[PDB]
Design a protein around this ligand. Structure first.
Ligand SMILES: [Cl-]
Ligand SMILES: [Cl-]
Ligand code: NA
Ligand code: NA
Length: 129
């Protein structure tokens, strides 16, 4: 599923990601835009052999099991394919764990390089939330 911008904002808010660990909703929408273009089905291989999955590009070395990643910890205790669902619940639950890990949203490279320090409220401008 390719979410619309405000559509994803509303889903993320309903799921309690807005202001989660102090990250306003625009941060999460901005991160999803650059990580996945709002596409739940997005996957990308990493150099280390792990793969990133879903709207928030959650990694198979630490967070989910994809059955092919050396050193997988599966800390979210989920198959990586569950993170590709049109229902974002599993991605949100796992993102809450990741962002609590100590580095906040710096865990997402695209967030640090493209969202951090910018006017992230722009990402939810116009939406009815
Ligand atoms: Cl915001
Ligand atoms: Cl933080
Ligand atoms: Na894909
Ligand atoms: Na992989």
């Amino acid at each position: 599923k390719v979410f619309g911008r405000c559509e994803l904002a509303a889903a993320m808010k309903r799921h309690g990601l807005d202001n989660y660990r102090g990250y306003s909703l625009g941060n999460w929408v901005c991160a999803a835009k650059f990580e996945s273009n709002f596409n739940t089905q997005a996957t990308n291989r990493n150099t280390d052999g792990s793969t990133d999955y879903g709207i928030l590009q959650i990694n198979s070395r630490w967070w989910c099991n994809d059955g092919r990643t050396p050193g997988s910890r599966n800390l979210c205790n989920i198959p990586c394919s569950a993170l590709l669902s049109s229902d974002i619940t599993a991605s949100v639950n796992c993102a809450k764990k990741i962002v609590s890990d100590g580095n906040g949203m710096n865990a997402w490279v695209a967030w640090r390089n493209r969202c951090k320090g910018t006017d992230v409220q722009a990402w939810i401008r116009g939406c009815r939330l």
